[PDB]
Design a protein around this ligand. Structure first.
Ligand SMILES: O=C1C[C@H](O)[C@H](Cc2ccccc2)NC(=O)CCCCCCCCCCCCCNC(=O)[C@H](Cc2cccnc2)N1
Ligand SMILES: *[C@@H]1O[C@H](CO)[C@@H](O[C@@H]2O[C@H](CO)[C@@H](O)[C@H](O)[C@H]2NC(C)=O)[C@H](O)[C@H]1NC(C)=O
Ligand SMILES: [Cl-]
Ligand code: NA
Length: 350
């Protein structure tokens, strides 16, 4: 079988969310569809955080199939953390069900982690980085032979650069579970193989990057000759090591680091009227990033300068990834996340 999750685009390409249904009878939530993590969670109806008061929450008491545990749920993300307890219940998404899905019932987060219309997150990466230790929903489906083809196809629609776009765009793209949508891509899928040691994040090596015509040194002390890149639908921008960000922005005339005193340390800005030509090379092919994705607009009162989509963030040496390649990149390609043989594919959008 195949099934489709319709994506809502929240925050002008900040996050892409889909409907999950939990419990008996079904409680529905809009959850971030996140290829950079592996846990399902939803805000619990007992949560007293302000954000929980202003969005849909999961009432464990009205699900006849909910199995409670005292087991702590604690997950850290780049953007902060979520805590509560594990539970088990029937979960449905894209017309599939996992009857005994373990997931987090969240009752506290760091400030501003999520808000209306979101209620939580669905991890689409591999069981080995699940904080819960539970098999991810998608991975159970792929492993059970429920899919026509053992892959997920991803199309993220672009609203950045649309001056009349809303903060909530229900026409936000599509995830196809169990195949690729041939109406949304053109030509052949370029698959980059993932070996059995790399099944954690969804990640592949970066071969090269060209900005304003110049091939950037993508060597790093953390990632050696070539960085391993998380291909992460749950990240807005593109996070690279500090030395790499300095080298990228050195290729754009007039580019500068935003100061610590701006509040935007890690970000860089460059002349607004410079259209940046930039590509990333994966599996022997150059994939361009459109100017509408690269240029985030003016962060300061200096309206002649605009922030770029590449930001500096040094990673723990415990991390197997040195880059986080988010939606800023992914919006430019149709993406195949392939379970077996494990791979990430890219195709030109239709
Ligand atoms: O955060 C992420 C990336 C993810 O797409 C989130 C999703 C999100 C977005 C909006 C709200 C909540 C969750 N994305 C983000 O957090 C968006 C900002 C990302 C900034 C760039 C990523 C830097 C992350 C590295 C340090 C974090 C610690 C490890 N944490 C991670 O790597 C975890 C997964 C994980 C691994 C191992 C154990 N536990 C959880 N994934
Ligand atoms: C593949 O993508 C196409 C294009 O987005 C989807 O086509 C839509 O499907 C619905 C009903 O299935 C139609 O009512 C819409 O008019 C279609 N939209 C367009 C723009 O063509 C298609 O459903 C997707 N296929 C799968 C299997 O997910
Ligand atoms: Cl280029
Ligand atoms: Na490396």
């Amino acid at each position: 079988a195949t099934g489709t999750v319709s994506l809502t685009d929240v925050g002008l390409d900040a996050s892409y969310a889909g409907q999950v249904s939990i419990g008996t009878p079904a409680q529905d939530f809009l959850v971030i569809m996140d290829s950079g993590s592996s846990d399902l969670w939803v805000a619990g109806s007992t949560c007293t955080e302000n954000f929980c008061k202003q969005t849909y929450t999961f009432d464990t008491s009205t699900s006849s199939s909910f199995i409670t545990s005292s087991e702590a749920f604690n997950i850290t993300y780049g953007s902060g953390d979520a805590d509560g307890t594990l539970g088990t219940d029937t979960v449905s998404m894209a017309g599939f069900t996992v009857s005994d899905q373990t997931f987090g019932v969240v009752t506290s987060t760091s400030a501003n982690l999520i808000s209306y219309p979101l209620s939580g997150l669905m991890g689409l990466a591999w069981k080995s980085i699940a904080s819960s230790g539970a098999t991810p929903f998608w991975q159970t489906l792929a492993a059970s032979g429920d899919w026509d083809s053992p892959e997920m196809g991803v199309y993220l629609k672009r609203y950045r650069g649309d001056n009349t776009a809303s903060q909530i765009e229900t026409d936000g793209g599509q995830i196809l579970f169990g195949g690729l949508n041939t109406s949304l891509y053109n030509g052949s899928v370029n698959y980059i193989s993932i070996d059995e040691s790399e099944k954690d994040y969804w990640r592949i090596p970066l071969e090269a990057m060209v900005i304003q015509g110049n091939s950037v040194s993508i060597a790093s002390s953390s990632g050696g000759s070539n960085p391993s890149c998380a291909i992460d639908t749950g990240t807005t921008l593109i996070g690279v090591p500090s030395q790499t960000a300095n080298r990228i922005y050195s290729q754009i005339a007039g580019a500068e680091a935003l100061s610590a005193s701006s509040g935007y340390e890690g970000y860089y800005q460059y002349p607004c009227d410079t259209e940046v030509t930039v590509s990333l090379q994966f599996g022997g092919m150059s994939y361009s990033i459109s100017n509408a994705d690269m240029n985030l607009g003016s962060f300061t009162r200096d309206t002649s300068m605009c922030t770029g989509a590449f930001f500096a963030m040094d990673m723990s040496s415990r991390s197997p990834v040195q880059w986080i390649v988010g939606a800023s990149f992914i919006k430019n390609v149709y993406t195949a996340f392939r379970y077996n043989p494990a791979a990430i594919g890219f195709a030109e959008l239709a």
